[PDB]
Design a protein around this ligand. Structure first.
Ligand code: AWQ
Length: 289
């Protein structure tokens, strides 16, 4: 009887993710209707607090570090590929790219880590969805681009479209990359129970440590900040956390393994802030203004 209203972005990726979640939730056979309402992060959240919509599906790396009171992340499904992906026009791996090669990405996080590995290449802004950026790679003045492996996966691109999957040792992923967030109201106990079966605890634990570090550093998509957690055999969370200068010449990196997501994320931020990472972040945020 109850029709769950799911608010979604207009883009092809967002609607693809939203339909995937709805089809997943339907496998539980519980009596709910689902209906997408095409609707900015503030607009979605206020519409959810206004109860105009009941939930929304976002890429976790696009979630704000701080949710407004009354809203929660109700479900984090099994994580897809977390890695950044290099796609080279002429098929060169990162270490094979010619001197001065132009790599297209508008993410300071991605560009700064690449420049920290090779400062003889250039990072240049690029816009468009996956299909657009891939076509720009064939023409134009880019020697390679960086995309999220999970985005390529969810958009039906073959794994062999990627020239090189970047391991965290070369590029620490954005916090939450490869994960989805289902946002809903904190007191919507009915929806929360429905979302429980889709939640993957191991993914949620790791992402929770990433997000605590992101929150305590006041980070976001515009900040060269990165964090990736995974569950080790025995239950320990391993968190790699990184803050980089835009030019790639300053790298704050912290590796922490432990049991508690909040404790690990908190220590990561504390250790990096004491070295000067927070001062770097504030300078980059100022330079954007
Ligand atoms: C937070 C965020 N969201 C997207 C889609 C991106 C990548 C942008 C790009 O041009 O590569 C980011 C930044 C990030 O750290 O991945």
């Amino acid at each position: 009887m109850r029709k769950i209203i799911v608010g979604s972005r207009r883009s092809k990726l967002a609607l693809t993710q939203t339909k995937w979640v709805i089809e997943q939730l339907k496998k539980q056979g519980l009596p709910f209707e689902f209906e997408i309402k095409e609707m900015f992060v503030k607009e979605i959240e206020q519409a959810m607090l206004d109860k105009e919509i009941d939930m929304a599906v976002h890429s976790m790396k696009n979630m704000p570090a701080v949710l407004p009171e009354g809203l929660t992340i109700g479900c984090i499904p099994l994580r897809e590929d977390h890695r950044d992906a290099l796609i080279s026009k002429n098929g060169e791996r990162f270490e094979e790219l010619p001197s001065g090669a132009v790599i297209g990405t508008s993410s300071l996080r991605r560009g700064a880590q690449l420049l920290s590995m090779r400062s003889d290449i250039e990072i240049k802004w690029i816009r468009g969805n996956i299909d657009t950026r891939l076509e720009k790679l064939k023409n134009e003045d880019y020697d390679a681009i960086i995309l999220a492996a999970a985005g390529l996966s969810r958009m039906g691109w073959s794994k062999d479209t990627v020239t090189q999957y970047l391991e965290p040792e070369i590029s620490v992923p954005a916090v939450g990359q490869g994960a989805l967030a289902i946002e809903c109201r904190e007191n919507d106990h009915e929806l929360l129970s429905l979302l429980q079966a889709l939640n993957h605890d191991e993914t949620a634990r790791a992402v929770r440590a990433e997000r605590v570090f992101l929150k305590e550093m006041e980070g976001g998509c515009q900040v060269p900040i990165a964090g990736y957690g995974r569950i080790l055999d025995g239950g320990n969370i391993e968190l790699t956390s990184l803050v980089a200068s835009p030019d790639g010449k300053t790298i704050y990196k912290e590796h922490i393994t432990g049991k508690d997501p909040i404790a690990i994320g908190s220590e990561a931020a504390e250790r990096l802030t004491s070295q000067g990472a927070k001062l770097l972040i504030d300078r980059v945020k100022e330079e954007l203004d």
